[PDB]
Each structure stands twice: as structure tokens, then as C-alpha cells.
């Protein structure tokens, strides 16, 4: 069975003040065994080292983002390898607010993950189409196109989750229902299993990015192919810990 | 006069142990009053709390860049007001390597250049021709068009420091003479002087962000219009004492 598994993506967000707040909430939390959930808090680049060093041993730490290659005269940017050094295991890539305002390619994208694997992080990788997308018929042409450029530069797969993003619901007034992501989540497992193995589709995690709180976490944790969540907002709050207990039976 | 002002880039370089060695290496440094020299140092976010808890309090520490606005819902980005939180005063803005290669536009740079401003932070704001542009005549129609970006943003100049990067001279063959240097520091003063004020060009620091080293700093930082460096790779090195010390009588 593939371990159910709840990101937190803190975005552009936090105080020093803030981040011991939530890592002393985190702390202090009592959430499934680690048997049934992973669990993995994602903090702007400037506070990594205060969560890594101060967060619970079982809660793990992600970079929101990382260079698509080794570092040197990239001024403003941070390598895997940085990551690596500061012992910062996970790195959220292709997030769809970098595709859309950073204008974060497939393709971009697909070698960062490539890069990011090769110095021994752990990838979420994310997709999603917009609602312009969605609207056209293309939700399943543009989730396949982003997946196969990850897919294209990626030879083993043990250390990656895709996140699926409804980006269409995401700031729109549309609400994705969890039969919407449930489909999504099936028709790229499907792909998965067609375009790379049935062994990688079976053991990848698909993790669910759109709205996630406490009253739809279990509802949307119970589909058949959602493995678990990348929780935006409610990532800096308490409730983050209602949806780590999504995992529970 | 205007204070003689050397700004070390680190660039997307470093770990823990080479950092702890950079900052005690600064740490033991002897180099010109606070009087003579402004010296500033710009880790990757990563290390920007390391740096600002260990450095001496009379070297200061800038970002690499910062997010165009308000934080949020901006995966990757850190924003001026987490660097104001975390007591780093400066950031450097428009760095050709964020022009060039992530694509930031003249108005994305003056943006940002106005939002870390109006946050309280003081800005090294980057300009500079390309091979093509320079050998098309168009070094002066480029750098007064990237500084008026920032310019028709910008109501106070008092922590501003232009820097002036020949990337016609970085990577090509090519190598600017401490006459090239000057000729453009003086243009770019004399836009200045006509397009916001007497006052501004007098006092606002133009430094020299092309090749800088032990060999050249002198000839370079004696120019009349040439104010300072932002140093690239020396700044990783002992030799970076060097050139702050291009300051001294
Ligand atoms: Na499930
Ligand atoms: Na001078």
C-alpha cells in the first residue's frame, strides 16, 4: 500500500516569531504513526535551517524550490546541493504559482527534478492545468505534457510525489469536488502505468493540491487515488494537523 | 564625498563549513574605518541567518534578490519584508544573471527596487549592456533605460547604490579597462544628474560590478565617477580583504 503522505507549503510566508510558533504546534502535536502518514513542512529558504534544527525528527523539511543545475553565477538562486549540505531532504518543484508567475517550463521543470534527484533530494512534483485549460478539454492533455517532461528526464522514481494542482479552482469561484480529483488523480496513475511502469504507477503517491481543510480532508484522503495532500494555507495553521489525521483508520 | 562602498556576491555558492570560514576569515579582517569603506556581504537566503548571527556588526549582510511585492501565495520567494524581519538590511536587485537568464524585465526590477525601498531595505540596483548591445552602440540607450525603470519608481535615492555590470566583459574575451569603467560611471552619473537631480548624481555610490581583483581594484576604485565593486567570485576568497582595502589613503 502506498503511505499516505501530507506536505505543507508555508509559500511566501513567516516571521521568525511565526515559524517557532508553528514548529512549537507541530511539535506538540499527536498524529498518526509513521507507519500510515509522511509528513513534510515546507518554510521559505531564509527559515529551512531554524525548522530543520528545531522541528520533531519525524516531521521532515522541504525546499519551496531549488536551481535546475549545480550552483555557481546564479545570483539569487539556491542549489540542491545547498539544500543537501543544510541535511533539508525534500524540495517542492513545479509548483503552479512558478509555472504561471515564475513562467517555470515543462520542460525546466522536468530538469530540476532530474538535478534535484541526482544530489539525493526528494521531489514533490507538481501539475495542474488552469481553468482556460480545464474549459478547452485539455485537462488531461496539459497533466500528461507536464508529467511526461518529468517523466523524459527521470530513470527511478522511489523519491518522488506528484502533487496534481486544480489550478481551474484555485482563485477562479470553481470548487474541484473530490469525484473531480479522484478522476484526475485515476486518469494520471493510468498514465503513469502506460508511459513508465505498472510497478511505478502501483508505488508513486498522488497527492491532492487544491483547497484542503478539515471538513473535506477525509472525504478527499478516502478516493481510491489520492495518496494525500499538498496543503497550502492551512499549512501555517493548527488545522494542518486535522488534515495529517486524514491518515487515520 | 561618497563613501567608497564594496559589495561581495556571493552568487549560488556555499555550504556551512565554507560560510563559518568566510565570516571568520571577515571576522579577523583589518581594513579601513566605517568612516572610508561600507562593506556588504550577500549569502544565499539559505545562510542569511547564519551570516547576519556571526558577522561583525560593521560589515552588513544583503540578500541576492527578494519577491517584486507582499509575500503569500508566491511558492520559492522570499519577500522584503522576511529580510526586514530577520535584520538583513541590504538586497541586490536586477543582478544581470536574474536579467539574463530568469528573464526580469527593467520594470520588474524597478518594481522590486521600489517595494524593498518602501520595506525599509537599502538596494544594490544592478544595470548593465551585453556584448550585442555594446557592440550595436547601444551601452548608454540600455543602462539609461534600465536605471530610468528604476528611476520613475524611486522617490528617495538615500539607499540606493547603482551598480554598473559590463556583461560584454564577463564570459566573451572581452575586458573592460578602468577607461571603460569610468566612461560609463560618468554617462551614468550625468543621467542621473538631468533625469532626477543635481544632489542625487552627487552623492548616490555607482560601483563597478565587472571583473574585481587585488591586481585591478586600485586603478578602478581611484575613477572619478567609480564609487566601489560588487566583487563576484573574490568575495568567496581571502582576497576579498584586498579589494575592500582599495578604499585606504
Ligand atoms: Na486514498
Ligand atoms: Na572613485
Given at each position: ?65 531549488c536551481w535546475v543545475k549545480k550552483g555557481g553565477a546564479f545570483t539569487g538562486e539556491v ?50 492545468e488552469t481553468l482556460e485549460e480545464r474549459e478547452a478539454g485539455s485537462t488531461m492533455d ?67 493540491g487544491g483547497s484542503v481543510n478539515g471538513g473535506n480532508c477525509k472525504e478527499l484522503g ?28
Open positions: 500500500a502506498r503511505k499516505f503522505f501530507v506536505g505543507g507549503n508555508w509559500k511566501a510566508n513567516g516571521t521568525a516569531e511565526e515559524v517557532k510558533k508553528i514548529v512549537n504546534t507541530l511539535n506538540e502535536a499527536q498524529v498518526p504513526s509513521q507507519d500510515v502518514v509522511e509528513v513534510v513542512v515546507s518554510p521559505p529558504y531564509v527559515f529551512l535551517p531554524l525548522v530543520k534544527s528545531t522541528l520533531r525528527s519525524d516531521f521532515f523539511v522541504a525546499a519551496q524550490n542549489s540542491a546541493e545547498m539544500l543537501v549540505n543544510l541535511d533539508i531532504p525534500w524540495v517542492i518543484l513545479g509548483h503552479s504559482e512558478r509555472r504561471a508567475i515564475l513562467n517555470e517550463s515543462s520542460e525546466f521543470v522536468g530538469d530540476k527534478v532530474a538535478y534535484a534527484l541526482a544530489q539525493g533530494l526528494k521531489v514533490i512534483a507538481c501539475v495542474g496539459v497533466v500528461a505534457a507536464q508529467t511526461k517532461a518529468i517523466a523524459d528526464r527521470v530513470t527511478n522514481w522511489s523519491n518522488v510525489v506528484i502533487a496534481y494542482e486544480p489550478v481551474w479552482a484555485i482563485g477562479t469561484g470553481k470548487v474541484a469536488s473530490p469525484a473531480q480529483a479522484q478522476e484526475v488523480h485515476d486518469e494520471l496513475r493510468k498514465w503513469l502505468a502506460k508511459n513508465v511502469s505498472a510497478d511505478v504507477a502501483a508505488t508513486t503517491r498522488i497527492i491532492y478516502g478516493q481510491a487515488d489520492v495518496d494525500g495532500f499538498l496543503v497550502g494555507g492551512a499549512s501555517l495553521k493548527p488545522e494542518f494537523i486535522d488534515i495529517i489525521k486524514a491518515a487515520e483508520v
